[PDB]
RNA sequence: GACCUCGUGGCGCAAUGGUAGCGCGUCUGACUCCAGAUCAGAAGGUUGCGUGUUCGAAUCACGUCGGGGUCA
RNA sequence: GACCUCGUGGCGCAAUGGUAGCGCGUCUGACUCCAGAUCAGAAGGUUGCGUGUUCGAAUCACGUCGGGGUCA
């Protein structure tokens, strides 16, 4: 697959080691999430500082986001949200979720209306993940921008402190780009500063922020961590995750356009099964005889990587890794297992989502004081 | 002085001729303002289209702005506002005034708080000009941005349609600039689109806008007029004004830093006099004998250019132009005259300004439906 | 305002008498426990528009829309 | 994260034994009805900070703050 240890060293982040994991445990009195245990969330930035504060009764809040590329979301999209929902429960902190409808409107051929609608439609599945209506604010850039005292003020502060060359260097823009993309990064940085949410943090400017996100989002926050000092704020802490594997392989890329690219949150019990069997890449030997002697390759097998994300029972996963690695299990049974797991899983989601009424999305997306004052 | 006819041809605007002036008269049933008569507002863009609509009962609104560089404003600053106040009265249309506190915060070493305060302090003199509290909305970018449904949405629409090279070309920015300056132009364009003021134009998107402004502001609107079609809107009409002359000469530049650079709205009866006599550049001959034979040079004489802006009585101005041009009047009397005019003028302002209470600035700057629904 | 330029078969790109190439691509059959490789086949709304000039125009002239590039 | 670089007398810029230049600049006197030109003079909080190494440091080493430039 891909070498994440090099990414870490490359970018400058830090590896999450057992020490850290154990701290999280001692600090939360709850067994750390399997993403932490199984290396899905492998890198971090300043997580110890976060823990130190937390353990010393100093408040911190969660910040994560979603780009509403489309109405169709897929299993891969849920990882950061799933983990964030867990972090919220376990630490009992408020959460802020950014729907970058304005970003997609900029990067894709979408109309302001479409973008927004996707931001709202997506809010449903994000909500379906179980976030506490009392301590989480899901917001649309297009909306919130125009109904906030602090948000825009921080963008302007952040923009006055980031040159085109910087973003050119970081994001690789070009003189040919729209001034809208050139300064969009400021918008994604802004929610890293508590006072961007006056109605929930009280013009407070030193509240620690922890940003769980996929490893590829880091550049935005590297730029953010960079400006913060320069503007009198504290830099956001980070917990990075690995990329979710496409059905065709860890290497290949997945889009909301290729439906056979991944399992979508709307797929049916039957579609789930079909996708795995007819598209999930394998690490299993060609002939079944070959497999029995050599055993599968757990490292490149998409189906197994999947279980790694959704088979919660730590022991059962092992039984599979073992019997699969040795050859005792044919990729056929493996896949069969992944389905037996995914089906009830997506079904579950689809139900929780249906319970999300319009008035619930409304509340979630309404800026207001949150439980933990 | 400077050749404005070349500016016109250069930029692509149009000269305001008697034909146009007479139309304005026929259309308003009021004698056109002396700025129009005396060539202070000399260039325009689509003014006839505006008139056509107006004469055919189609609504149009006024849009002009102010950069709150500082708390100290000077006579030169008032020209566009004076003329705008006249246009409002005469056509009876609503007006929108932009205080670019966010622009100064970006271009000058100011803090968000300072900028805003200047935006508010300046609002006072702008209000002191007589605008109708019922049909004019003075607003701060920093404020309004965060309390508007449409404004930000138009910036994003405008930004998705203006490349860095464009602004680089138009404004001459550089890769070295902050992403904040690079896309600031979108912000100044946005108020050219009625639906940026939903609470006053009702999500209406085709209301004609007329932007009175100093000739050097045009580039922003050339860029604006350019995007508009591309985003489904109508391009703003323009009425350009000449530059107000610095006390040292039409050529030299004036800043709120050099106090002897111009007559400031706070100066005293005595300071007024001092500034003219001790700094107002002259077109008068060296020796008084020389003057008597050659006569002054009305073209470069700052003091006379001043009367051109504030001596309202068309005939009296002539008496001066004549007796001065021939030599019958020494620049000494000329200057003496300019003072006798300016003193009561500034005094007046200072009083009107004092009547502007905090609750009045508040109302003006509060987004709300305006008289002409 | 003006001028320059580009405007493809789902995306990325090629100038008429022989099979318009695939970079990527999908769907069919075969072989494997699957998936991939491989082998054998099929299909895909074709020229941004509108007038033209020519025997013939994707390859030309005018107008037009959109992307990108340009001027104290 | 790291490294490169810059960090002036109101602004823009210059490497010790002779008057640290003015580009712009202000305020004084003179000459003109004024203003400007011109002529004659004066002044302006001086090295981003903090330690140092040296006889001597604006010109060097470490740390630091800020601007700008940099890396699959
Ligand atoms: N830019 C991310 C969404 C996002 C915005 N803010 C964030 C903060 C943390 C993680 C993700 C985000 C995307 O396109 O999906
Ligand atoms: N940018 C102008 C102010 C301004 C903003 N919007 C405007 C519209 C018309 C005229 C002036 C303005 C300035 O700096 O003074």
CB of A98 within 6 A of ligand 1: the answer is yes
Strands (E), B106-192: 136-140
Residue B262 phi, psi (nearest 5): -170, 175
Helix A218-230 to helix A164-171 angle (10° resolution) is: 150
Give B88's Cβ-side CA count (13 Å radius). 24
**Domains identified in chain B, total number:** 2
**What interhelical angle do B331-354 and B269-279 show, nearest 10?**
150
* Distance in angstroms between the alpha carbons of the first and the last residue of chain A: 44
- Asked if strand C comes closer than 7 Å to A327 Cβ, the answer is no
Rounded to whole angstroms, the Cα distance separating B224 from B236 reads 8
Cα–ligand 1 centroid distance for B304 (angstroms): 61
The structure tokens listed for A226 are 């960079």
For residues A324 and A294, the answer to whether their CB atoms sit within 8 Å is no
Contact B208, B235 (CB under 8 A): no
User: What is the C-alpha to C-alpha distance for residues A350 and B117, in angstroms, rounded to an integer?
Assistant: 52
Q: Which residue has the tokens 């997945």?
A: A254
Q: Which of A146, A66, A159 is nearest to B156 (CA)?
A: A146
Q: What φ, ψ does residue B139 adopt, rounded to 5°?
A: -135, 150
Indicate if A199 and A343 belong to the same structural domain. no
Look at residues A363, A308, A86 and name the one whose alpha carbon lies nearest to residue A210. Answer: A86
Is the CB of residue B192 less than 8 Å from the CB of residue B211? Answer: yes
Q: Starting from the edge strand earliest in sequence, which strands make up the sheet with B41-45, in order?
A: B14-15, B41-45, B237-241, B208-214, B60-66, B95-99, B136-140
- The C-alpha angle with vertex A55 and arms to A52 and A61, in degrees rounded to 5, equals 80
Q: Are residues A17 and A153 in the same domain?
A: yes
How far apart CA B291 and CA B283 sit, in angstroms, is 10
Asked whether the beta carbons of A94 and A133 are under 8 A apart, the reply is: no
- SS3 at position B227: helix
Residues B242 and B298 in one domain: no
- Neighbouring-strand partners of residue A45: A238
Give the pairing of strands A14-15 and A41-45: antiparallel
Whether B205 contacts chain A with CB within 8 A: no
Q: How far apart are CA A277 and CA A353, in angstroms?
A: 27
Phi and psi angles of residue B113, each rounded to the nearest 5 degrees, phi first: -65, -45
Separation of alpha carbons A65 and A96, rounded Å: 8
**Cα nearest neighbour of B174 on chain A:** A164
Q: Are B68 and B101 in contact (CB under 8 A)?
A: yes
Pick among A102, A167, A179 to test the B interface (most B CBs inside 10 A):
A179
Q: Residue A372, Cβ neighbours under 10 Å: how many?
A: 13
For residue A171, what are the contacts with CB-CB under 8 A and spacing of at least 6? A185, A219
Parallel, antiparallel, or unpaired: how do β-strands A95-99 and A136-140 relate?
parallel
The CB-side HSE value for B171 (13 A sphere, CA atoms) comes to 23
In the structure encoding, which two tokens stand for residue B60, read together?
């149009």
**Residue that terminates a domain, selected from B220, B254, B288:** B254
The CATH number covering residue B197 comes to 3.40.50.620
Burial of B113 (0-12, 13-18, 19+ CB in 10 A): exposed
Q: What angle do CA A132, A105, B219 make, to 5 degrees?
A: 130
Give the rounded distance of the alpha carbon of B298 from its chain centre: 24
Q: Does B170 contact A at CB distance below 8 Å?
A: no
Indicate the pairing of strand B41-45 with strand B60-66.
Answer: unpaired
Q: Decide: residue B370, CB within 10 A, 0-12 exposed, 13-18 middle, 19+ buried.
A: buried
> Are residue A104 and residue A238 in the same domain, yes or no?
yes
Nucleotides in D strand less than 7 A from protein CB: 1, 27, 32-36, 65-72
Whether residue A265 contacts residue A346, with contact meaning beta carbons closer than 8 Å, is answered with: yes
Nearest alpha carbon to residue B161 among B178, B185, B195, B142: B185
Instruction: Name the resolution in angstroms.
Output: 3.1
Nearest CA to ligand 1 atom 4: A65
- Of B234, B254, B274, the last residue of a domain is B254
| Nucleotide minimizing C1' to CA distance for residue B230 | C66
Which residue from A264, A247, A213, A187 is spatially nearest to A81, judged by alpha carbons? Answer: A213
- Residue A161 beta carbon within 7 A of nucleic strand D: yes
Provide Rg for chain A, Cα atoms: 21
Residue A3 vs residues A214, A243, B82, B193: alpha-carbon distances, Å: 15, 11, 67, 51
Last residue of a domain, one of A233, A254, A275: A254
Ligand nearest to the CA of B209: 2
Which single residue is written with the structure tokens 């050097």?
B216
By the 10 Å C-beta count (0-12 exposed, 13-18 middle, 19+ buried), A60 is classed as buried
Q: How far is A223 from chain B (nearest CA, A)?
A: 13
Residue B267 neighbours by CB under 8 Å, 6+ apart:
B275, B346
- The 3-state DSSP class for residue A47 equals helix
Show the domain range for B325. Answer: 255-373
Angle at Cα A30 formed by Cα A130 and Cα A355, nearest 5°?
10
| Residues A322 and A226 occupy one common structural domain | no
Instruction: Round to whole Å and give the CA distance between B108 and B111.
Output: 9
Beta bridge partners of B238: B45, B211
Q: How many residues does chain A have?
A: 373
Q: Is the dihedral of CA B124, B125, B128, B134 positive or negative?
A: negative
Chain B environment of A182 (Cβ under 8 Å): 164, 179, 182-183
How many CA atoms lie within 13 Å of B156's alpha carbon, on the beta-carbon side?
A: 27
The CATH number of whichever domain residue B349 belongs to comes to: 1.10.240.10
Are B279 and B240 found together in one domain?
no
Locate the ligand 1 atom nearest the alpha carbon of residue A104 and give its number: 14
A56 Cβ contact list (under 8 Å, min separation 6): none
Q: Cβ(A84)–Cβ(A96) under 8 Å? A: no
Identify which ligand lies nearest to the alpha carbon of A106: 1
Scanning residues 150 through 209 of protein chain B, those with a beta carbon under 7 Å from any atom of strand D turn out to be 175-176, 178
CA quadruple A294, A297, A303, A306: dihedral sign: positive
Q: What are the two backbone dihedrals, phi and then psi, of residue A189, each rounded to the nearest 5 degrees?
A: -80, -50
* Inter-CA distances, A76 with A98, A139, A253, B96, B159, Å: 18, 21, 11, 47, 31
**Residues contacting residue B261 through CB under 8 Å, at least 6 positions apart:** B74, B246, B247, B248, B254, B255
Whole-angstrom Cα distance, residue B327 to residue A67? 74
Q: Which atom of ligand 2 is nearest to the CA of B100?
A: 5
How many alpha carbons fall within 13 Å on the CB side of residue A338? Answer: 29
Terminal Cα-to-Cα distance of chain B (whole angstroms): 44
Strand, coil or helix: B33: coil
Q: Do B176 and A163 touch (CB under 8 A)?
A: yes
For residue A5, what are the CA distances in angstroms to A1, A15, A262, B64, B77? 12, 8, 26, 56, 60
User: Distance between CA atoms of A302 and A290, rounded to whole angstroms?
Assistant: 19
Are A193 and A280 part of one and the same domain? no
Strand pairing of B14-15 and B41-45?
antiparallel
Q: Which of A50, A46, A49, A39 shows the shortest CA–CA distance to A12? A: A46
Q: Are residues A141 and A23 in the same domain?
A: yes
Contacts with A173 (C-beta within 8 Å, 6 or more apart), sequence order: A164, A167, A181, A182, B164
CB pairs A-B closer than 8 Å: 122
> CA-based angle B123:B125:B128, to the nearest 5?
110
Q: Please name every residue paired with B163 in a beta bridge, in sequence order, or none if there are none.
A: A178
Around Cβ B12, how many Cβ atoms within 10 Å? 11
Task: Answer for the pair A163, B179: CB distance below 8 angstroms, yes or no.
Answer: yes
Main-chain phi, psi angles of B88, to 5 degrees: -60, -55
Residue B59 to residue A70: CA distance in whole angstroms: 39
Q: Does residue A183 contact residue A159 with C-beta atoms inside 8 Å?
A: yes
Helix (H) or strand (E) holding B49: helix B47-55
CA dist., res. B362 & res. B366, Å (int): 6
Report the 10 Å Cβ neighbour count for B277.
Answer: 15
Check whether residue A94 and residue A190 sit in a common domain: yes
**Where is A242: in which H helix or E strand?**
none
Whether A50 and A208 have beta carbons less than 8 Å apart is answered as yes
B213 CB within 6 A, ligand 2: yes
Taking the CA atoms of chain B, what radius of gyration do you get in angstroms?
Answer: 21
Are A85 and A120 part of one and the same domain? Answer: yes
Alpha helices in A92-217 (DSSP H): 101-107, 112-127, 141-145, 150-159, 164-171, 179-182, 184-189, 198-201
Which residue's CA shows the smallest distance to C1' of C67? B161
Are residues A192 and A132 part of one domain?
A: yes
Structure tokens at B57: 């009962």
CA A364 vs CA A94, A99, A124, A360, B108: distances in Å: 12, 12, 10, 6, 39
Could you tell me if B152 and B145 are in contact, meaning their C-beta atoms sit under 8 angstroms apart?
yes
Distant-in-sequence, close-in-space partners of B287: CB < 8 Å, separation ≥ 6: none
Neighbours of A344 (CB within 10 A): 12
DSSP state of B78: H
Whole-angstrom distance, CA of residue A353 vs CA of residue A128: 5
3-class DSSP state of B249:
strand
Indicate whether A259 and A223 sit together in one domain: no
Q: Does A111 touch chain B (CB under 8 A)?
A: no
Q: Which of A321, A327, A291, A319 is nearest to A306 (CA)?
A: A321
Q: What are the two backbone dihedrals, phi and then psi, of residue B140, each rounded to the nearest 5 degrees?
A: -100, 135
Q: How does DSSP classify residue A30?
A: S
Tokens of B275: 């500034």
């Amino acid at each position: 697959g891909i070498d994440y240890d090099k990414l870490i060293v490359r970018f400058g982040s830090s590896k999450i080691d057992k020490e850290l994991i154990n701290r999280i445990e001692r600090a939360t009195g709850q067994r750390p999430h399997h993403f932490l245990r199984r290396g899905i969330f492998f890198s971090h930035r300043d997580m110890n500082q976060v823990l130190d504060a937390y353990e010393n009764k100093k408040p911190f809040y969660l910040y994560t986001g979603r780009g509403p590329s489309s109405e169709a979301m897929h299993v891969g999209h849920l990882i950061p949200f799933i983990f964030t929902k867990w972090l919220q429960d376990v630490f009992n902190v408020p959460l802020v979720i950014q729907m970058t409808d304005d970003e997609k409107y900029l990067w894709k051929d979408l109309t302001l209306d479409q973008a927004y609608s996707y931001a709202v439609e997506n809010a449903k599945d994000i909500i379906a993940c179980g976030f506490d209506i009392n301590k989480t604010f899901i917001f649309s850039d297009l909306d919130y921008m125009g109904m906030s005292s602090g948000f825009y003020k921080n963008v302007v502060k952040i923009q006055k402190h980031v040159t085109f060359n910087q973003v050119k260097g970081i994001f690789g823009f070009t003189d040919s780009d729209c001034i809208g993309k050139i300064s969009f990064p400021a918008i994604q940085a802004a929610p890293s500063f508590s006072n961007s949410f006056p109605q929930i943090f009280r013009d407070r400017t030193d509240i620690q922020c922890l940003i769980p996100c996929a490893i590829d989002q880091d550049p935005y926050f590297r730029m953010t961590r960079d400006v913060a000092p320069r503007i009198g704020y504290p830099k956001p802490a980070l917990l990075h995750s690995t990329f979710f594997p496409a059905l065709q392989g860890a290497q290949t890329k997945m889009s909301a356009s290729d439906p056979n690219s991944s399992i979508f949150l709307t797929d049916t019990a039957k579609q789930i099964k079909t996708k795995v069997n007819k598209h999930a890449f394998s690490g299993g030997r060609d002939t079944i005889e070959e497999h029995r002697q050599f055993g599968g390759n757990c490292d490149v097998d998409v189906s197994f990587m999947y279980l790694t994300f959704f088979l919660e029972d730590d022991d059962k996963l092992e039984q599979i890794r073992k019997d699969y690695t040795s050859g005792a299990m044919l990729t056929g049974e493996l896949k069969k297992a992944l389905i037996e797991v995914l089906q009830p899983l997506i079904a579950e989601h689809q139900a929780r989502r249906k319970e999300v009424t319009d008035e619930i999305v409304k509340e979630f997306m309404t800026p207001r004081k949150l439980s933990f004052d």
